[PDB]
Every structure is written in C-alpha cells, then in structure tokens.
Amino acid sequence: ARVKRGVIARARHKKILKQAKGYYGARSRVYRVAFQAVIKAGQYAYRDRRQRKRQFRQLWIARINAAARQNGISYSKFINGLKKASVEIDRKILADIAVFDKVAFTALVEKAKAALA
Amino acid sequence: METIAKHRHARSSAQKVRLVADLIRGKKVSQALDILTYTNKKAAVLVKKVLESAIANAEHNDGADIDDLKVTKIFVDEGPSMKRIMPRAKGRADRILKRTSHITVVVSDR
Amino acid sequence: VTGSGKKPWRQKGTGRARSGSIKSPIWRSGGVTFAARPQDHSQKVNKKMYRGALKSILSELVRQDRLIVVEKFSVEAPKTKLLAQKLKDMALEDVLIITGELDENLFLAARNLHKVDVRDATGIDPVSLIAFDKVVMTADAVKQVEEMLA
Amino acid sequence: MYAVFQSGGKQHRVSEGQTVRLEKLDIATGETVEFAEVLMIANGEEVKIGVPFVDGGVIKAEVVAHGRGEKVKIVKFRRRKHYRKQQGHRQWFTDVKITGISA
Amino acid sequence: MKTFTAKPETVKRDWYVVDATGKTLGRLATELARRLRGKHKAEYTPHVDTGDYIIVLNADKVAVTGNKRTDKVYYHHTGHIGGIKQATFEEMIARRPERVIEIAVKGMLPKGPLGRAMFRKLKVYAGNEHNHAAQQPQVLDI
Amino acid sequence: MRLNTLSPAEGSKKAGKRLGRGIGSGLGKTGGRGHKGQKSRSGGGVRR
Amino acid sequence: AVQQNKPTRSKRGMRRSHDALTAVTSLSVDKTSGEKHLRHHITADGYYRGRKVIAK
RNA sequence: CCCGGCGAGGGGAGUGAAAAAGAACCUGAAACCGUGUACGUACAAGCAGUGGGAGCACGCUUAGGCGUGUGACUGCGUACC
RNA sequence: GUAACGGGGCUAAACCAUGCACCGAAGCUGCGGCAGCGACGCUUAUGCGUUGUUGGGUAGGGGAGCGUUCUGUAAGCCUGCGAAGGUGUGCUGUGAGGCAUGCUGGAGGUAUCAGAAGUGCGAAUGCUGACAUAAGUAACGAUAAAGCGGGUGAAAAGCCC
Structure with missing residues (x-):
C-alpha cells in the first residue's frame, strides 16, 4: 500500500499562491514566501477593519475644527455644547463641508455655545 | 504571415545575448541589421545569420517582400548545459557549466 | 540495505548530512520506516457475535422482501442457456442462487451473466448474503444455513 | 446634497447619488426606506438643528440589494510560540441608495 | 457603492502671500507649518494633504527670541581633525535671512517623504525685497 | 442490495487520520506525547 | 564578500x-561606390x- | 521552398485527428531565461504588506470614489520556524 | 550628528494655584450577523422563543473530518456527444476541503458509506533530481615570445605553405 503523495497539498499550494498574486516577486510564484506573506496580510487586514475608523476620526475632527472656531468658540467647547443642549445628539461626523465654505452651520455652533452652561 | 528562425545549441550564454538583444528590441528589421553589424561581439554575428533566415523565408509561400516585415520578437532561453569538473589550485574540484543558448527571432508584418 | 560497515557520518564537526548509516529510510531508495506492517489489526470475532450478526441480516433480508424461497431451478441438462430461460420464465433474474443440494446441473448452469450467479451454502458469511439484487436461495440451503445460525 | 442621520446606533455622513451599505433591515429589495431621525441637512445652508425624528425633514432612500456576504477569514497568531488559528465569517447586510434629502 | 470616503480629487492649494508683519520667528513658523500641512481650514484625506503654495514676503528678519539656539547647533559629518566641523546658528543670518525661518517650518513636517512633498511648496528668499513674488497671490495675515 | 451500507456508532472508527503533521494545524509541535529527555524525542520504547 | x-x-x-555597445545610424551610400560601409570610414x-582596402 | 560554409538550427509548403503530437515528440506544474500588451518607475527609499487613492481600459458605478486588472501618491505597520 | 522634551517651536505655548473641557483602545456601548451551553416558557422523537455568563490561547489533554494510494457496490452507470492532467474566476463551508465553468486537454472517471496505509513537506548545516545564485564578475598554466603574404576554407596575427 504505497502512496504516491502530493496532490491535496498541491491544491493548498495553489490556493496560497492564488491568494498571493498581485504581490511582489517570489511571493506570487514560490510557496514558502507566499505563506509568509498571506499570514502577515490577513493580520494587518484584520487590524485595519477597526483601525481605518480610528485614523479617519482624526480627519473628521480636524475638518470640523477649522469651521467650528470660524463660527465662534473652539472644537472641545462646541462638542460640550452639543452634550449640554437637549434633544440633540453629540457627534464628530456631523459635516463633510467643514473642509471648504465653513460659514454654513453657524446656527448649530451658536446653539452649542449658548447651551454650553 | 509570420516566420520563426531559431538557432538552438548555439555558443552564447543569455547574459551575453541580452547586451545585443536590447539594442535590436522591437526595432524594425532593416535598422536592427544596420545596428547589428557595427557590434563586433560573437553573439551579434550569431543573431545575423538567424535574422537573414527570418526575413528571407517570409517573401514566399506565407507572404511577399522583405522590407515591410519587422522583428516582433527577440528572445533567448536556457538550452541544455554540459557539466565538467575543472582541475584548479590547492586540489579544488569545482563545477564549470558550459552554457548554450536557444535563440529565437520572430518576424511578421505588424 | 547494502551497507553496515560504512557510515556517511565519519567525525561530524562541520555542516553535513544527518544520516549516519547507508540503509536509512530517509535515503532516496533506503527501506522506509513504517513498513513491513499487517494489513488489518486483529481477526477472531466472538462466535455469538458472528452467528448473531448473521441472524440480524437474515431477518432484514425478509424485511426487505428479497426472499420468496424457490427450490429446484434445475433442468435435464447442465447448460446455462437452458437455466437462464428457466429463470426468465420464473420472472426472477439477477438473483443470488444458494444451492443446499450441490446438484452439478444447477451449479454448472446459471453463471454466464454478470449478475446471475450460483453458489453453495458452505462457509457462510455476512458479506455474501448482501451481494446482488436479491437473494432467492433454495429451501435446501435454508435448512443448511439455519443450523450454522443456530 | 449632504446630510447626517442616526440609524441603528451609529451616526453617518452621506451625499446625494450615494449607494451605501448599512446594518440589516427587514425591508425587502424594491421597497422604500425613509429616515425621520435625520440630524441636520448641511450643503452651504445655515441650520439650527441637531434634532432626531424631525418631521418636515426626511432622507428618502431605497433598498438596492439585501444579501449575505462572501466568506472573510480572520487569522489569530503569535510568533515564536507555534500559535496559528483561523476562523471565517460573512455578516448579512442591506445596500441602500439615497434619492432624498429635504429641509 | 461604498461607504462615504475621502479621495485626492476634492482638495486643492491655490497661491498665498503672507504679509504678516514684524512677527516673531517661531510664532510665524508654527502658523506657516500649520497651513503647509493644512489644518487651519481642513484635513480630510489620510493619503494626501490640503496644503497651500506659500510665499513669505514679510517678517523674515528676527532671531529665535529664546534659548533653543545654544542647545541645538545642528552638527554634521563633513571631515575634521581634533574635533568635528559644524555649521553655526550664527552663519545662517549673514548668508541671506531665509535660513532661520526655513529650519523653523522644515522641522514642523512629518517623517521623510511626506515632509518633503509638503516642504517643496514653501518659498522664502531674502524677504521684504525678493522678486520671487511677482504673481501677486492671495494676500493673508496670520 | 444492502452492501456498502455498514456504519457503526461514534468512537468505533479511525476515519482516516494520522497526526504530527501541519505547522498551521497545531500538530507541528508534538501532541499525544510530551517533550525532552529519553521520554519523547527519539523514543521511549526501551525504558522499563 | 559573500x-x-x-x-x-x-x-x-x-x-x-549601461554597458551594451554602440553603432552608427542609417544604411550608408558612398560618393564613389554602391557599397555600404561604416560611415566616415573606408x-x-x-x-x-x-x-x-583590406587583405587576408 | 527559404536562410548557411561543406554546417547548426528553425520556418513556410505538404502529412495527420492532433506537430499549441516535429522526432528530448504522451497532457504538463514549478524552478528556469526572454518577448509582447495594459498601466507604472526621474522631490525620488525601509520584511515590499495592509488601509486610503488621482489616474488608464473595460462595466450607463443608478459618477458619488464602486466591480475587474493595474496604479503617481501616501496614513499605518518589525519575516516564518 | 543636535541626539538628557521624540523633534520643530515656546523667555509663556513653561512650571505652579483655583477650575472646566475635550480628544483618546476590538475596552464601556448601540446597531447587524453568528457559536455552543445554563435558567425559565412553549414542551419535543426531531426543536424553537424569551433570557444568560459566554467565544485570545502555548505547553498539554480529549473529540471529529478531508483527500491521496488501494479495496467493496464497480457485476452498475458516464465518456471523444470531450475523461484525468494544466489555468483564471465565481460559488460554498468553521477549516481542511468541496462544487460549478469558459479556455486548455484527447483518454479516462465516479459518489454514499465503511476500511487498510510506504498517506500530505517547509524547514532535520536530512537524502536525491533538474537548475538558479552573487556575474558575464574573477581566472589567461613556468611571459620556449612573434611577424605578415599566399592557400585547404565559410571564417586566419597564431593553422598549411
């Protein structure tokens, strides 16, 4: 009962190497380095599912800041304003147009500054 | 339309053919044959007789004329290498590989 | 395997081969390691367990309606071609025929087909009874099988 | 036109013409989504509010796909200690298309 | 078909001339740096930056106004004996007024490559006299 | 035709497996056995 | 070093x-013969x- | 029938079901060396990967940054045993 | 080579006194998906609803499945009306794996379900094969050297003369 071997594992190779295309050099054509690359890939990927959302959030706060200060007080008082004002959600994703033409929403910023009690 | 000339088991290595090959790369037949004869490397005579077969067999029975054809492909692959053991200082019994090339020229109208 | 008086390990203290005898299983041809083994792990079977499995399957062959028990399919002559026109007339083809009579005219007939087959009831076993589309037997075999099962 | 609303339990910024994916709904494909929990509309416009369930202001949408996702894999790993293990998950979703925004 | 996301197509620079006057070296310097990343107006995208093209034409001719000079004198390898040869803080003023202003905004930008992509948008020169302002940009006080 | 229809209860079957194989699976390091000494490295089938 | x-x-x-050897350009004619040559040379x-010219 | 030196080696033409069967000829990975297209590389760098992406071909993206293949640029980030 | 804020920069943008804020983790939390199992309801051979702590994991324990070589139905059935083999992609499952399909391909293939094993390689300075690598880099065998016309020849400073 000889076994010839290397047909199931050959399919595991071709699956590793299929997922490892669009990668550089030996990663896209040799098993060993392909495997190495695949395990590092899916770990970074799974960091970045959550992590994109941390990184982006800075960019939402930094666009809102330049508007918010132009419409009165500065970002951290405005956010405490939104916390104090009733029937009103506090959030840091309220506007994408705090980037350019930042005179809009002045009335929401004055609602928070007044409400900052 | 298209014709292969090869020379297989030829006396070059591919490091030695590539110097000549990038000058004549996709470069039209007539201009490449002018550039080639002003290269006095051993590889450059080899590729000459092989370009001349490429152009000439096309003017019959697949086509006609020689001026209008272009060198669409120019390439080298590893032929079968002969291994020898070299006698050498201090009793060293090192490998020498006697490389050959398989040289392909392809011409077509293109 | 063609050496014991020769080690490929002969004062190792450099970067070298791990094998150290020329008959190793990790040699290209050397006699591999998990070899010369048995092809099943033990074989006996308890008598009550063997004889009681044959009772079980036998009840099921009646529960699947494979039995209708027909004695003597035999004719005047041992030719298959006569028996097979006999089996077509009884409307039971492709059947496991069990003889208890060892009649040469039946055993040497009904065999020229890939599913028409005749056997003797001797040295019964659980694997035989389950083969082929149905098992028809003769009443002579049913006596002679029942006493191996009881 | 740009807008913020509160749905499910997140707040989300969005434009007009936009196809977005959200947390699963009951609404089938080819039947209306409408959001009264819209927190403000802001497109060059001065506005008072941050208020939910506001009445006059709606974001109208539609379902464009209700599905289940293609198999993702998550790999859990620590070097040097011979630790490697793997799981899969899909998550169900709705895609909606924003064909709304009123103020 | 995706989530709302940012991209390099939505942000621009234009040209700004900073006529902010008589203003202290570092109090000039963090505001220019702030705008050379962009932050004073926005920052939206993770991969590129808001930015301005910045000419300084005013307030290029005052010292650090403190002690930073004497504990960070920017030594380099350049070949010596007995010691090491260095640039001095003192050299910088005598060979055009820019260099004091210049290593105040340089040092305010990130890493290697991004800090360089940002940096190449600043111009400063001799200051209050420099021809490299003929455009007449958007005027600005900070 | 009740042939190739055998199936018994759980725990009474090998189900085509041998162990000590893969470096992702968990069997890259030893399992069902220990480590170090003459107990589990080369052997153990010569200590009484 | 290794x-x-x-x-x-x-x-x-x-x-x-940055090694591969150079050439003249264009298939030459000559003032006194239908022969091609290397340009600005015999x-x-x-x-x-x-x-x-030439022998052997 | 073509090229060459008496040569080497190949094509065209014709054989055949097949020469993507041309003689090491079964179908044929992967190492192996080179062409051809698309897009890319000259303010430009590090486990070469992940997240974000101008742009270019093809998909009316339901143009609202998407599918597919690539990708100026860049946030983030230390191989496996 | 600053290099004892991580750096620019800050003679207040520091430090201290009173006090307030914000940003800041898969944490705490909401939306949506999902695993097994306690408690209670329906009430069961087979499960489901409410509710619930829960689901990072080596050493090491314990349980289950896959396919490869081969066996039984396979004695059947599918096959040049396009099989194994190669290759891209979609689908599917927790993973292995499985399944579909255009191109390729011109003879081979198959469950269910049980069962044997020379049973899957990426490591052993493991053994073997093809062949890559730094590199067209280094080496020019006592430095008994060479010249140049003709010729056998395709090709000649070095051969033959």
Missing part, C-alpha cells in the same frame, strides 16, 4: 543596462575616396 539572500532578476537587468571592399 551575500545574505539570493539577489533579484530586476538587479541582473539593471547592471547590464569602405572595406570598394572605393570611398579613391583606392580599395
């Missing part, structure tokens, strides 16, 4: 990029500015 890994095939292409078997 190395520390196997190098790249992108390197092999890079090191021979026609190898014919007339270029009177006389012929």
Whole structure:
C-alpha cells in the first residue's frame, strides 16, 4: 500500500499562491514566501477593519475644527455644547463641508455655545 | 504571415545575448541589421545569420517582400548545459557549466 | 540495505548530512520506516457475535422482501442457456442462487451473466448474503444455513 | 446634497447619488426606506438643528440589494510560540441608495 | 457603492502671500507649518494633504527670541581633525535671512517623504525685497 | 442490495487520520506525547 | 564578500543596462561606390575616396 | 521552398485527428531565461504588506470614489520556524 | 550628528494655584450577523422563543473530518456527444476541503458509506533530481615570445605553405 503523495497539498499550494498574486516577486510564484506573506496580510487586514475608523476620526475632527472656531468658540467647547443642549445628539461626523465654505452651520455652533452652561 | 528562425545549441550564454538583444528590441528589421553589424561581439554575428533566415523565408509561400516585415520578437532561453569538473589550485574540484543558448527571432508584418 | 560497515557520518564537526548509516529510510531508495506492517489489526470475532450478526441480516433480508424461497431451478441438462430461460420464465433474474443440494446441473448452469450467479451454502458469511439484487436461495440451503445460525 | 442621520446606533455622513451599505433591515429589495431621525441637512445652508425624528425633514432612500456576504477569514497568531488559528465569517447586510434629502 | 470616503480629487492649494508683519520667528513658523500641512481650514484625506503654495514676503528678519539656539547647533559629518566641523546658528543670518525661518517650518513636517512633498511648496528668499513674488497671490495675515 | 451500507456508532472508527503533521494545524509541535529527555524525542520504547 | 539572500532578476537587468555597445545610424551610400560601409570610414571592399582596402 | 560554409538550427509548403503530437515528440506544474500588451518607475527609499487613492481600459458605478486588472501618491505597520 | 522634551517651536505655548473641557483602545456601548451551553416558557422523537455568563490561547489533554494510494457496490452507470492532467474566476463551508465553468486537454472517471496505509513537506548545516545564485564578475598554466603574404576554407596575427 504505497502512496504516491502530493496532490491535496498541491491544491493548498495553489490556493496560497492564488491568494498571493498581485504581490511582489517570489511571493506570487514560490510557496514558502507566499505563506509568509498571506499570514502577515490577513493580520494587518484584520487590524485595519477597526483601525481605518480610528485614523479617519482624526480627519473628521480636524475638518470640523477649522469651521467650528470660524463660527465662534473652539472644537472641545462646541462638542460640550452639543452634550449640554437637549434633544440633540453629540457627534464628530456631523459635516463633510467643514473642509471648504465653513460659514454654513453657524446656527448649530451658536446653539452649542449658548447651551454650553 | 509570420516566420520563426531559431538557432538552438548555439555558443552564447543569455547574459551575453541580452547586451545585443536590447539594442535590436522591437526595432524594425532593416535598422536592427544596420545596428547589428557595427557590434563586433560573437553573439551579434550569431543573431545575423538567424535574422537573414527570418526575413528571407517570409517573401514566399506565407507572404511577399522583405522590407515591410519587422522583428516582433527577440528572445533567448536556457538550452541544455554540459557539466565538467575543472582541475584548479590547492586540489579544488569545482563545477564549470558550459552554457548554450536557444535563440529565437520572430518576424511578421505588424 | 547494502551497507553496515560504512557510515556517511565519519567525525561530524562541520555542516553535513544527518544520516549516519547507508540503509536509512530517509535515503532516496533506503527501506522506509513504517513498513513491513499487517494489513488489518486483529481477526477472531466472538462466535455469538458472528452467528448473531448473521441472524440480524437474515431477518432484514425478509424485511426487505428479497426472499420468496424457490427450490429446484434445475433442468435435464447442465447448460446455462437452458437455466437462464428457466429463470426468465420464473420472472426472477439477477438473483443470488444458494444451492443446499450441490446438484452439478444447477451449479454448472446459471453463471454466464454478470449478475446471475450460483453458489453453495458452505462457509457462510455476512458479506455474501448482501451481494446482488436479491437473494432467492433454495429451501435446501435454508435448512443448511439455519443450523450454522443456530 | 449632504446630510447626517442616526440609524441603528451609529451616526453617518452621506451625499446625494450615494449607494451605501448599512446594518440589516427587514425591508425587502424594491421597497422604500425613509429616515425621520435625520440630524441636520448641511450643503452651504445655515441650520439650527441637531434634532432626531424631525418631521418636515426626511432622507428618502431605497433598498438596492439585501444579501449575505462572501466568506472573510480572520487569522489569530503569535510568533515564536507555534500559535496559528483561523476562523471565517460573512455578516448579512442591506445596500441602500439615497434619492432624498429635504429641509 | 461604498461607504462615504475621502479621495485626492476634492482638495486643492491655490497661491498665498503672507504679509504678516514684524512677527516673531517661531510664532510665524508654527502658523506657516500649520497651513503647509493644512489644518487651519481642513484635513480630510489620510493619503494626501490640503496644503497651500506659500510665499513669505514679510517678517523674515528676527532671531529665535529664546534659548533653543545654544542647545541645538545642528552638527554634521563633513571631515575634521581634533574635533568635528559644524555649521553655526550664527552663519545662517549673514548668508541671506531665509535660513532661520526655513529650519523653523522644515522641522514642523512629518517623517521623510511626506515632509518633503509638503516642504517643496514653501518659498522664502531674502524677504521684504525678493522678486520671487511677482504673481501677486492671495494676500493673508496670520 | 444492502452492501456498502455498514456504519457503526461514534468512537468505533479511525476515519482516516494520522497526526504530527501541519505547522498551521497545531500538530507541528508534538501532541499525544510530551517533550525532552529519553521520554519523547527519539523514543521511549526501551525504558522499563 | 559573500551575500545574505539570493539577489533579484530586476538587479541582473539593471547592471547590464549601461554597458551594451554602440553603432552608427542609417544604411550608408558612398560618393564613389554602391557599397555600404561604416560611415566616415573606408569602405572595406570598394572605393570611398579613391583606392580599395583590406587583405587576408 | 527559404536562410548557411561543406554546417547548426528553425520556418513556410505538404502529412495527420492532433506537430499549441516535429522526432528530448504522451497532457504538463514549478524552478528556469526572454518577448509582447495594459498601466507604472526621474522631490525620488525601509520584511515590499495592509488601509486610503488621482489616474488608464473595460462595466450607463443608478459618477458619488464602486466591480475587474493595474496604479503617481501616501496614513499605518518589525519575516516564518 | 543636535541626539538628557521624540523633534520643530515656546523667555509663556513653561512650571505652579483655583477650575472646566475635550480628544483618546476590538475596552464601556448601540446597531447587524453568528457559536455552543445554563435558567425559565412553549414542551419535543426531531426543536424553537424569551433570557444568560459566554467565544485570545502555548505547553498539554480529549473529540471529529478531508483527500491521496488501494479495496467493496464497480457485476452498475458516464465518456471523444470531450475523461484525468494544466489555468483564471465565481460559488460554498468553521477549516481542511468541496462544487460549478469558459479556455486548455484527447483518454479516462465516479459518489454514499465503511476500511487498510510506504498517506500530505517547509524547514532535520536530512537524502536525491533538474537548475538558479552573487556575474558575464574573477581566472589567461613556468611571459620556449612573434611577424605578415599566399592557400585547404565559410571564417586566419597564431593553422598549411
């Protein structure tokens, strides 16, 4: 009962190497380095599912800041304003147009500054 | 339309053919044959007789004329290498590989 | 395997081969390691367990309606071609025929087909009874099988 | 036109013409989504509010796909200690298309 | 078909001339740096930056106004004996007024490559006299 | 035709497996056995 | 010195990029013969500015 | 029938079901060396990967940054045993 | 080579006194998906609803499945009306794996379900094969050297003369 071997594992190779295309050099054509690359890939990927959302959030706060200060007080008082004002959600994703033409929403910023009690 | 000339088991290595090959790369037949004869490397005579077969067999029975054809492909692959053991200082019994090339020229109208 | 008086390990203290005898299983041809083994792990079977499995399957062959028990399919002559026109007339083809009579005219007939087959009831076993589309037997075999099962 | 609303339990910024994916709904494909929990509309416009369930202001949408996702894999790993293990998950979703925004 | 996301197509620079006057070296310097990343107006995208093209034409001719000079004198390898040869803080003023202003905004930008992509948008020169302002940009006080 | 229809209860079957194989699976390091000494490295089938 | 890994095939292409030998351009005619030559140099078997050249 | 030196080696033409069967000829990975297209590389760098992406071909993206293949640029980030 | 804030920069943008804020983790939390199992309801051979702590994991214990070589139905059935083999992609499952399909391909293939094993390689300075690598880099065998016309020849400073 000889076994010839290397047909199931050959399919595991071709699956590793299929997922490892669009990668550089030996990663896209040799098993060993392909495997190495695949395990590092899916770990970074799974960091970045959550992590994109941390990184982006800075960019939402930094666009809102330049508007918010132009419409009165500065970002951290405005956010405490939104916390104090009733029937009103506090959030840091309220506007994408705090980037350019930042005179809009002045009335929401004055609602928070007044409400900052 | 298209014709292969090869020379297989030829006396070059591919490091030695590539110097000549990038000058004549996709470069039209007539201009490449002018550039080639002003290269006095051993590889450059080899590729000459092989370009001349490429152009000439096309003017019959697949086509006609020689001026209008272009060198669409120019390439080298590893032929079968002969291994020898070299006698050498201090009793060293090192490998020498006697490389050959398989040289392909392809011409077509293109 | 063609050496014991020769080690490929002969004062190792450099970067070298791990094998150290020329008959190793990790040699290209050397006699591999998990070899010369048995092809099943033990074989006996308890008598009550063997004889009681044959009772079980036998009840099921009646529960699947494979039995209708027909004695003597035999004719005047041992030719298959006569028996097979006999089996077509009884409307039971492709059947496991069990003889208890060892009649040469039946055993040497009904065999020229890939599913028409005749056997003797001797040295019964659980694997035989389950083969082929149905098992028809003769009443002579049913006596002679029942006493191996009881 | 740009807008913020509160749905499910997140707040989300969005434009007009936009196809977005959200947390699963009951609404089938080819039947209306409408959001009264819209927190403000802001497109060059001065506005008072941050208020939910506001009445006059709606974001109208539609379902464009209700599905289940293609198999993702998550790999859990620590070097040097011979630790490697793997799981899969899909998550169900709705895609909606924003064909709304009123103020 | 995706989530709302940012991209390099939505942000621009234009040209700004900073006529902010008589203003202290570092109090000039963090505001220019702030705008050379962009932050004073926005920052939206993770991969590129808001930015301005910045000419300084005013307030290029005052010292650090403190002690930073004497504990960070920017030594380099350049070949010596007995010691090491260095640039001095003192050299910088005598060979055009820019260099004091210049290593105040340089040092305010990130890493290697991004800090360089940002940096190449600043111009400063001799200051209050420099021809490299003929455009007449958007005027600005900070 | 009740042939190739055998199936018994759980725990009474090998189900085509041998162990000590893969470096992702968990069997890259030893399992069902220990480590170090003459107990589990080369052997153990010569200590009484 | 020795190395520390196997190098790249992108390197092999890079090191021979600035080495390969030059040529004159355009298929020549000559003032005194239908013979092609290397330009601004004696026609190898014919007339270029009177006389012929070469032996053996 | 073509090229060459008496040569080497290949094509065209014709054989055949097939020469993507041309003689090491079964179908044929992967190492192996080179061409051809698309897009890319000259303010430009590090486990070469992940997240974000101008742009270019093809998909009316339901143009609202998407599918597919690539990708100036860049946030983030230390191989496996 | 600053290099004892991580750096620019800050003679207040520091430090201290009173006090307030914000940003800041898969944490705490909401939306949506999902695993097994306690408690209670329906009430069961087979499960489901409410509710619930829960689901990072080596050493090491314990349980289950896959396919490869081969066996039984396979004695059947599918096959040049396009099989194995190669290759891209979609689908599917927790993973292995499985399944579909255009191109390729011109003879081979198959469950269910049980069962044997020379049973899957990426490591052993393991053994063997093809062949890559730094590199067109280094080496020019006592430096008994060479010249140049003709010729056998395709090709000649070095051969023959």
